[PDB]
Design an enzyme around this catalytic site. Structure first.
Site, PDB file in Angstrom:
ATOM      1  N   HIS F  77      -9.018 -42.689  18.107  1.00 47.48           N
ATOM      2  CA  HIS F  77      -8.681 -41.948  17.142  1.00 47.48           C
ATOM      3  C   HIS F  77      -9.907 -41.375  17.020  1.00 47.48           C
ATOM      4  O   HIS F  77     -10.378 -40.025  16.189  1.00 47.48           O
ATOM      5  CB  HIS F  77      -8.372 -41.968  15.731  1.00 47.48           C
ATOM      6  CG  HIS F  77      -6.473 -42.485  15.883  1.00 47.48           C
ATOM      7  ND1 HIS F  77      -6.425 -44.247  15.623  1.00 47.48           N
ATOM      8  CD2 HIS F  77      -5.348 -42.252  16.190  1.00 47.48           C
ATOM      9  CE1 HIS F  77      -5.479 -44.570  15.980  1.00 47.48           C
ATOM     10  NE2 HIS F  77      -4.359 -43.078  15.588  1.00 47.48           N
TER      11      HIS F  77
HETATM   12  S1  FES Z   1     -10.604 -44.656  15.047  1.00 44.98           S
HETATM   13 FE1  FES Z   1      -8.442 -44.612  14.136  1.00 44.98          FE
HETATM   14  S2  FES Z   1      -7.707 -47.041  15.002  1.00 44.98           S
HETATM   15 FE2  FES Z   1     -10.084 -46.962  15.173  1.00 44.98          FE
END
Ligand code: FES
Ligand SMILES: CCCCCCCCCCCCCCCCCC(=O)OC[C@H](COP(=O)([O-])OCC(O)COP(=O)([O-])OC[C@@H](COC(=O)CCCCCCCCCCCCCCCCC)OC(=O)CCCCCCCCCCCCCCCCC)OC(=O)CCCCCCCCCCCCCCCCC
Ligand SMILES: CCCCCCCCCCCCCCCCCC(=O)OC[C@H](COP(=O)([O-])OCC[N+](C)(C)C)OC(=O)CCCCCCCCCCCCCCCCC
Ligand SMILES: CCCCCCCCCCCCCCCCCC(=O)OC[C@H](COP(=O)([O-])OCC[N+](C)(C)C)OC(=O)CCCCCCCCCCCCCCCCC
Ligand SMILES: CCCCCCCCCCCCCCCCCCCC(=O)O[C@H](COC(=O)CCCCCCCCCCCCCC)COP(=O)(O)OCCN
Ligand SMILES: CCCCCCCCCCCCCCCCCCCC(=O)O[C@H](COC(=O)CCCCCCCCCCCCCC)COP(=O)(O)OCCN
Ligand code: HEC
Ligand code: HEM
Ligand code: HEM
Ligand SMILES: CCCCCCCCCCCCO[C@@H]1O[C@H](CO)[C@@H](O[C@H]2O[C@H](CO)[C@@H](O)[C@H](O)[C@H]2O)[C@H](O)[C@H]1O
Ligand SMILES: CCCCCCCCCCCCO[C@@H]1O[C@H](CO)[C@@H](O[C@H]2O[C@H](CO)[C@@H](O)[C@H](O)[C@H]2O)[C@H](O)[C@H]1O
Lengths: 124, 383, 54, 61, 85, 111, 71, 244
Positions: F77
């Site tokens: 993410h």
């Molecule tokens: S950035 Fe969402 S799981 Fe590590």
């Protein structure tokens, strides 16, 4: 919602000239697009009946009104299963769409609601 | 007296499948109940058969699934049937629930079958989630990791509960073996609840598309609905055939053909498609605990439809505004599904939040308002 | 038609026997028909078509 | 509209040869074919499916 | 709210005569071509707006969102992406 | 260099940080940090960053040396961790957890 | 020799000429920019991957069927 | 994500097996085995495939037994419990080039070449991805791309930098059937072979599917007739109401 509520709110609107001027035309189109008249129903035939109050109101219908309601339900069921609409005299005309059941249910509910109030009276 | 009526065992079957009095006007959306029963029977038959060849130990699980595909006679078919029927089960359950919502099947006197139905839906989700882990591919592991870590959000005890679920400090062998035992069990529990919601329904009977009583005009379940059910059974089997024989992996994720590797994380971890709307709802709330609550609430809120629907009329057939609102609600549910599998990037972050608000506002604001106004339009409009 | 009805259809025992016998025939003939059709549309591609080289 | 002895019109649906053996036989040919494909389909299904329990390829090797 | 055969819970019925004919006497596919064309057209025409409006709206929303997202992750969308994050 | 040791199925990132890396980490004002901590709170020995290499967002594993704060980047993410393994950018709420580790010898640690 | 070589060349000069020119112009810009000093200490270093993708996607659309036809 | 981060999407090539009624071309499968054996097998295992699996697909029993018998496999210990080797049998799995991951990574500058038995199912694109990747190494990376050490530019691979260099060049293989072994031909054959390795039930499955489609469609048609037949008394019902 109770029929009593619906009837009272509707009467508030019908009283107010402004409100009626804008609501009554809408309600008439709503009913036209609803299309229950095209299955030969009257509006009151659609009201949910599986409640004690409604079962009591239905039992108080005069026999003729009761027999005619049974026929409209059977006829509408046959249109539904056949995927057809009413034609001719089976279509409910606006003048035939009478509130045959509303007075009975309003009386049943009046007593039911008075009973609830009186169950909560406090001698002053 | 006929034996089917006299003998108490036969009479129970008779009451549900033969003499059962049905409305004469059920449309084809009343066929999803029998398709759901079919999916359940296929999943039991294929599932018990896969259990004869599958090994739940993490050192052997993924390979036992390859052995099924490669060596067991018709193993490819049994495996693909089981995997694709899990998707068909959710298509049928969404159709069945959408039928119920459109036609007012949740209204009195059918609150109890509807409420047990909401639990059946929760058990199906849990069953399907645990079964997906059993493959022990990359999506199996990483989906288990992410979803089981949501329990860590439970205040105070969350971390302890997670370690207790895993049987260790991460998803591993203990978790796989327990998911196998529970995945075998949960379908039997689900069958009991499916039976309970039918027994509860039997007191009122089936509703019908007009929303009126059918006590005036009943048809025996057999032969009419038996033969009408065969049409959709064969339509279902044609769809099943096209996926299982011609495109068996269309509904899957290629990463589940890579063995689970706790070190490497796959590019994107998403749940199976049928869980995607709930995942989008969870992403919409920035807080971990907030998101978990929202996600659970999105299912449990179905329990309040009997209250928030204020209509004096059952179902949407004759309610043009309710029909439009229902259309928007359903399409929003599909958009949430799509947003569950996009990347967390602009502009999908905000869009997911707006769709989440719309989802909840249907139950809390719009349906109570629209149903109130339509009551008044029916009354005034027919005076 | 009367004769056919009377022999194969009127008694359910006879009707079920006829249905099962027909299912047996259908199963065996359909197998052979599909096998031949499959071999014609996939001609030159299957092992049986190249086997002779080896 | 009033007399119940005047049967409603069923001429759009009624077959002229409704009492004949040929008429019945046709409908039983449809039912029979359906029963026949269901028997053949069940047999194929059961045979292919249950064969999973016979020795797998790695065992026969 | 439902009884059983013989006492189903109907209000008393009287005055309705019902008529039908044997399945062997009827043509099951009578009027099929008219139904398949004209009846389906009528039924579909009357429900079309309730499907078209929400489907078209949500498809438009998706199309705009997906096109913007695609553009933000090009070279041209560098600056707008920097602001958006 | 950063090592990855499996420890209870989770990855352990062990980085042998240079002098200037430690310096880079001791710069960021603690004030502006989702999870406010200084390297001295994190490490018990400045030359041994020992962390549980599971991202604090959902639980993916950050790819080291990558990022925007040149420490660790979670590809899932897009959350960026530091040379202290502190969260700087992206959805992740906390800094990469530090296991309970003790230097038995100066050449070996137990985790 | 490899049939692909000819087919790909033909598709680049023909139906995918606009994209070919875009890629070419991109390359010219980037190489020139790399030539200039203090490029290593620049914030944004442009690449030509995007233009390359547009070109290759186009060549593949015009070639895939033709190539498999001659194998 | 950037298009580069995703990787370029491969073209849809017209494979012989595309087509509801189409099998693999087994002559292509046999040629693809030869590319696997002479090129890929230096770095890539095919651990899920046994010698018996080739038989009656690409090779006769005798050819496959010959391939097995040329290798040595671990036997059960002898009577003093000392290790022994035996010749291969048809039941044996095709042996890989490396004893473990660490040895595989050491030979490939840190990169681990995946096992190829499921690769056609384990990547979006399947055969098209394998074909595109093998044939999609540009002579020069697009201007501006900085490859990490030991990486090669390939636009089909997500991020662009793959640890596998180009390996197929015109005439690295001499096919035994006289087919010109161009880069494109070899990539097509090996991609077909690997697709077969991932889904060896493919041909049987699609034929059984044809039988199922035909039977189920006929049953659907008949079920419509039967439903309409049985429902006609209900659909055709008429009423005369005389209000009491
Ligand atoms: S950035 Fe969402 S799981 Fe590590
Ligand atoms: C999955 C597993 C496979 C099994 C398949 C089961 C699906 C069967 C089912 O429930 O749907 C069939 C179902 C036909 O059922 P039906 O019993 O003929 O009518 C139910 C409705 O009353 C039909 O409503 P109606 O009578 O008002 O007719 C409307 C219908 C026309 O309905 C048809 O007859 C078709 O057409 C549409 O609404 C189309 C929408 C307009 C788009 C342009 O088709 C639809 O209703 C589709 C409309 C849904 C939107
Ligand atoms: C996409 C949007 C669909 C909205 C449907 C609006 C009504 C319509 O036109 O449908 C035709 C018909 C209309 O049928 P009807 O019963 O209202 O009317 C029959 C015809 N008259 C009015 C003359 C009696 O609707 C259905 O049959 C609706 C069933 C809903 C199933 C939805 C499944 C979605 C799953 C999401 C789960 C959460
Ligand atoms: C699932 C597998 C189903 C296989 C069905 C085997 C053949 C039985 C059959 O077709 O039933 C027709 C028969 C007869 O259908 P019928 O009951 O319509 O015919 C009765 C009237 N006569 C005998 C004059 C034709 O049904 C049964 O016997 C019930 C068994 C069905 C299961
Ligand atoms: C799957 C295969 C379909 C089943 C086919 C069975 C035989 C079909 C032909 C037999 C037949 O028509 O005879 C009837 C038997 O049907 C029956 O008795 C059964 C009728 C239809 C069976 C299907 C019931 C619902 C299907 C949906 C599945 C339910 C979900 C559970 C998984 C008799 O009956 P009659 O009264 O017409 O006889 C009239 C006079 N004897
Ligand atoms: C569990 C999943 C249920 C769905 C089954 C669909 C097809 C599965 C059948 C297996 C198969 O591939 O059969 C093909 C024929 O399909 C067919 O003809 C089968 C389609 C029939 C549909 C359902 C009819 C009844 C099946 C369920 C009843 C089972 C129990 C009742 C006793 C060809 O295979 P083949 O022809 O080579 O087979 C050897 C006999 N020649
Ligand atoms: C001498 C080394 C070597 C040879 C020869 C080789 N490969 Fe690879 N291959 C690799 C390495 C190393 C990787 C891993 C690259 C990476 O992940 O960065 C790889 C990766 C792959 C991948 C997966 C790329 C991905 O999406 O993860 C496929 C498919 C592949 N190889 C197929 C082949 C085929 C087909 C051949 C030959 C006909 C072949 N390889 C020849 C070393 C080789
Ligand atoms: C409602 C019923 C069921 C549902 C929705 C369901 C769902 C699933 C799903 C989604 C998978 C992953 C499939 C894959 O991708 O390979 C799976 C695997 C599995 N299921 Fe079920 N299942 C059900 C019933 C059962 C039952 C009753 C058993 C009995 C043991 C069972 C045994 C298995 C086994 C052994 C696997 C792993 C092998 C494999 O992946 O195919 N399932 N199930
Ligand atoms: C295993 C899953 C399920 C099975 C096998 C199943 C089966 C059935 C069947 C056979 C019926 C009667 C026929 C019909 O209306 O289609 C029915 C009715 C019903 N089901 Fe389900 N069901 C399942 C899941 C659910 C779920 C998840 C819900 C609700 C959230 C639900 C709520 C209802 C309701 C309310 C009815 C009555 C509808 C009516 O006739 O008006 N069911 N179900
Ligand atoms: C769905 C698969 C078929 C298996 C049947 C499902 C098993 C569930 C049955 C046990 C639940 C008890 O089921 C209950 O049984 C009795 C008689 O059997 C039914 O009773 C109904 O039928 C009988 C005669 O048919 C009448 O005496 C009675 O007036 C009527 O209410 C109930 O309406 C039903 O709720
Ligand atoms: C109560 C039911 C009675 C007992 C049930 C009997 C159980 C097992 C019966 C036979 C199972 C195996 O029987 C065998 O089935 C498979 C199909 O599945 C057939 O095999 C045939 O089709 C398969 C694929 O469909 C091909 O891979 C095969 O080359 C071909 O010969 C065999 O021709 C038959 O000999």
């Amino acid at each position: 919602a109770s029929i009593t509520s619906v009837v009272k709110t509707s009467e508030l609107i019908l009283k107010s000239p402004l409100l009626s001027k804008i609501v009554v035309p809408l309600a008439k189109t709503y009913v036209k697009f609803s299309g229950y008249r095209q299955l030969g129903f009257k509006m009151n035939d659609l009201i949910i009946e599986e409640t004690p109050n409604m079962q009591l109101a239905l039992r108080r219908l005069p026999p003729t009104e009761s027999y005619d309601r049974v026929y409209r339900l059977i006829r509408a069921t046959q249109f539904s299963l056949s995927h057809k609409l009413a034609t001719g005299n089976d279509i409910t005309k606006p003048e035939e769409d009478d509130h045959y059941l509303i007075p009975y249910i309003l009386d049943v509910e009046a007593e039911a609601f008075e009973k609830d109030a009186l169950d909560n009276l406090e001698v002053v | 007296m006929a034996l089917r009526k006299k003998n108490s065992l036969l009479n129970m079957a008779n009451s549900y499948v033969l003499d059962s009095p049905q409305p004469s006007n059920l449309n084809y959306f009343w066929n999803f109940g029998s398709l759901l029963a079919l999916c359940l029977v296929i999943q039991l038959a294929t599932g018990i058969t896969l259990a004869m060849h599958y090994t739940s130990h993490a050192s052997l699980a993924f390979d036992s699934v390859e052995h099924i595909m490669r060596d067991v006679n018709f193993g490819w078919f049994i495996r693909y049937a089981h995997a694709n029927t899990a998707s068909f089960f959710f298509i049928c359950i969404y159709a069945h629930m959408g039928r119920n919502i459109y036609y007012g099947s949740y209204k009195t006197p059918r609150v109890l079958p509807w409420s047990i139905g909401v639990i059946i839906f929760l058990l199906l989700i849990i069953t399907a989630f645990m079964g997906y882990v059993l493959v022990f591919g990359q999506m199996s592991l990483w989906g288990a990791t992410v979803i089981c870590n949501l329990v860590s959000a439970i205040p105070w005890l969350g971390e302890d509960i997670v370690h207790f679920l895993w049987g260790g400090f991460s998803v591993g062998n203990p978790t796989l073996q327990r998911f196998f035992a529970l995945h075998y069990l949960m379908p039997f529990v689900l069958a009991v609840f499916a039976l309970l919601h039918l027994i509860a329904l039997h007191t009122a009977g089936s509703s019908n598309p007009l929303g009126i009583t059918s006590n005036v005009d009943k048809l025996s379940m057999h032969p009419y609905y038996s033969f009408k059910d065969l049409i959709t059974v064969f339509a279902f089997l044609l769809m099943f055939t096209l996926f299982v024989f011609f495109s068996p992996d269309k509904l899957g994720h290629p990463d589940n053909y890579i063995p689970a590797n706790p070190m490497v994380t796959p590019a994107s971890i998403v749940p199976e498609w049928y869980l995607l709307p709930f995942y989008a709802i969870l992403r919409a709330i920035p807080d971990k605990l907030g998101g978990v609550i929202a996600m659970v609430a999105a299912i449990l809120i179905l329990l309040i439809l009997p209250i928030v629907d204020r209509s004096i009329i059952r179902g949407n057939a004759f309610k043009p505004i309710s029909k439009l609102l229902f259309g928007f609600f359903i399409c929003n549910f599909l958009l949430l599904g799509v947003l569950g599998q996009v990347h967390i990037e602009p502009p999908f972050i905000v869009l997911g939040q707006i769709c989440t608000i719309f989802y909840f506002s249907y139950f809390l604001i719009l349906l109570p308002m629209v149903s109130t106004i339509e009551n008044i339009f029916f009354y005034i409009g027919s005076l | 038609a009367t004769t056919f009805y009377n022999v194969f259809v009127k008694r359910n025992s006879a009707f079920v026997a006829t249905i099962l016998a027909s299912a047996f025939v259908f199963d065996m003939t359909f197998e052979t028909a599909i096998d031949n059709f499959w071999d014609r549309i996939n001609a030159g591609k299957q092992w049986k078509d190249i086997r002779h080289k080896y | 509209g009033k007399s119940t002895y005047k049967i409603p019109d069923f001429t759009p649906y009624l077959k002229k040869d409704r009492n004949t053996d040929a008429n019945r036989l046709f409908s039983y040919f449809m039912i029979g074919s359906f029963g026949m494909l269901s028997a053949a389909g069940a047999k194929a299904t059961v045979q292919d499916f249950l064969s999973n329990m016979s020795a797998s390829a790695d065992v026969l090797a | 709210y439902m009884g059983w055969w013989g006492h189903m819970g109907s209000p008393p019925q009287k005055g309705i005569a019902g008529y039908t004919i044997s399945p062997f006497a009827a043509r099951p596919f009578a009027g099929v071509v008219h139904a398949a064309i004209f009846n389906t057209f009528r039924r579909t025409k009357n429900q079309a707006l309730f499907v078209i409006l929400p489907v078209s709206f949500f498809y438009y929303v998706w199309t705009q969102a997906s096109e913007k997202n695609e553009w933000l992750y090009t070279k041209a969308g560098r600056h707008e992406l920097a602001k958006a994050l | 260099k950063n090592v990855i040791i499996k420890w209870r199925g989770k990855p352990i990132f062990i980085r042998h940080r240079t002098s200037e890396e430690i310096e880079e980490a001791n710069e960021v004002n603690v004030a502006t940090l989702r999870d406010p901590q200084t390297d001295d709170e994190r490490v018990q020995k400045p030359e041994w960053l020992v962390m549980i290499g599971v991202c604090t967002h959902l639980g993916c594993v950050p790819i080291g040396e990558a990022g925007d704060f040149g420490g660790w980047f979670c590809p899932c993410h897009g959350s960026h961790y530091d040379i202290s393994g502190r969260i700087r950018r992206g959805p992740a709420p906390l800094n990469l957890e530090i296991p309970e580790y003790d230097f038995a010898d100066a050449e070996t640690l137990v985790i | 020799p490899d049939p692909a070589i000819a087919l790909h060349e033909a598709a680049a000069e023909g139906p995918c000429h606009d994209f070919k020119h875009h890629f070419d112009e991109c390359v010219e810009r980037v190489t020139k920019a790399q030539e200039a000093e203090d490029y290593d200490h620049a914030e944004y270093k442009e690449d030509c991957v995007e233009e390359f993708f547009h070109l290759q996607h186009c060549i593949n659309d015009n070639t895939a069927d033709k190539l498999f036809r001659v194998l | 994500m950037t298009a580069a981060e995703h990787g370029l999407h491969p073209a849809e090539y017209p494979w012989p097996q595309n087509g509801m009624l189409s099998t693999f071309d087994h002559a292509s499968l046999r040629r693809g085995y030869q590319v696997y054996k002479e090129v890929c097998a230096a770095c890539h295992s095919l651990d899920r495939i046994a010698w018996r699996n080739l038989v009656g697909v690409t090779h006769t029993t005798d050819e496959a037994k010959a391939f097995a018998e040329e290798l040595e496999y671990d036997d059960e210990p002898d009577d003093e419990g000392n290790p022994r080797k035996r010749p291969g049998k048809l039941a044996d799995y095709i042996p890989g080039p490396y004893p473990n991951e660490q040895a595989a990574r050491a030979a490939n500058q840190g990169a681990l070449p995946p096992d190829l038995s499921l690769i056609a199912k384990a990547r979006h694109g399947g055969a098209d991805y394998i074909f595109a990747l093998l044939t999609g190494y540009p002579d020069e990376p697009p201007a501006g791309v900085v490859l990490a050490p030991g990486m090669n530019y390939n636009p089909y691979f997500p991020g662009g930098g793959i640890g596998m260099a180009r390996t197929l060049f015109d005439g690295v293989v001499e096919y035994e059937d006289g087919t010109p072994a161009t880069t494109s031909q070899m990539a097509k054959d090996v991609a077909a072979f690997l697709t077969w390795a991932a889904e060896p039930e493919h041909d049987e499955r699609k034929k059984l599917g044809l039988k199922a489609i035909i039977v189920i469609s006929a049953m659907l048609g008949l079920s419509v007739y039967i439903k309409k037949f049985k429902w006609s008394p209900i659909k055709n019902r008429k009423f005369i109401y005389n209000p009491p």
